[PDB]
């Protein structure tokens, strides 16, 4: 709304607004936040999840191995 007012003049009701904070490279920054956040996650996920693969084991690999 006000980019980032370095400060907002209430004397009148305007604002001096320098920072690119909220710019599209800031938007790429939040993209990065979520980016590497999810990546760490993805890794830990396929870590803690893909465990219970039956891999033919519970009913076919079993009978094979006998």
């Amino acid at each position: 709304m006000t980019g980032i007012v370095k400060w907002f003049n209430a004397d009148k009701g305007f604002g001096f607004i320098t920072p690119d904070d909220g710019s599209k490279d800031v938007f790429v920054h939040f993209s990065a936040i979520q980016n590497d956040g999810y990546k760490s996650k993805d890794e830990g996920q396929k870590v803690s999840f893909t465990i219970e693969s039956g891999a033919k084991a519970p009913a076919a690999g079993n009978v094979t191995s006998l």
């Binding site: 993209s31 980016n35 999810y38 990546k39 996650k41 993805d42 996920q45 999840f49 893909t50 219970e52």
Partner: protein, 110 residues
């Protein structure tokens, strides 16, 4: 005198855009704009807005006559791929790719 217009970081696949870009290679711009007008793909909206920008740049900055203009070079490059995580079953994660493009339209009197 060649005139370039680019839509960098085009939010679209290069494969999906090259289908449209192969329709207007070497054509007159009035024919390429009518083809892109009556092509129903989204990439036709992108490459039409780029061809219109190349026409206006050739007219303003270069004095080129519009009836003599011709799409001499057009090519789509791969852009940066933003990457998102889509969850699948059993806790498995897949990293989808959200492709971008760099559309380039070169128009000239040649």
């Amino acid at each position: 005198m060649e005139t370039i217009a680019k839509h960098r970081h085009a939010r679209s696949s290069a494969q999906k855009v090259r289908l449209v870009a192969d329709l207007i290679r070497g054509k007159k711009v009035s024919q390429a704009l009518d083809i892109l007008t009556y092509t129903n793909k989204k990439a036709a909206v992108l490459v039409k807005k780029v061809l219109e920008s190349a026409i206006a740049n050739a007219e303003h900055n270069d004095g080129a006559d519009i009836d003599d203009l011709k799409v001499t070079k057009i090519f789509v490059d791969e852009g940066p791929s933003m990457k998102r995580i889509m969850p699948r079953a059993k806790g498995r994660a897949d990293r989808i790719l959200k492709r971008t493009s760099h559309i380039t339209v070169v128009v000239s009197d040649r």
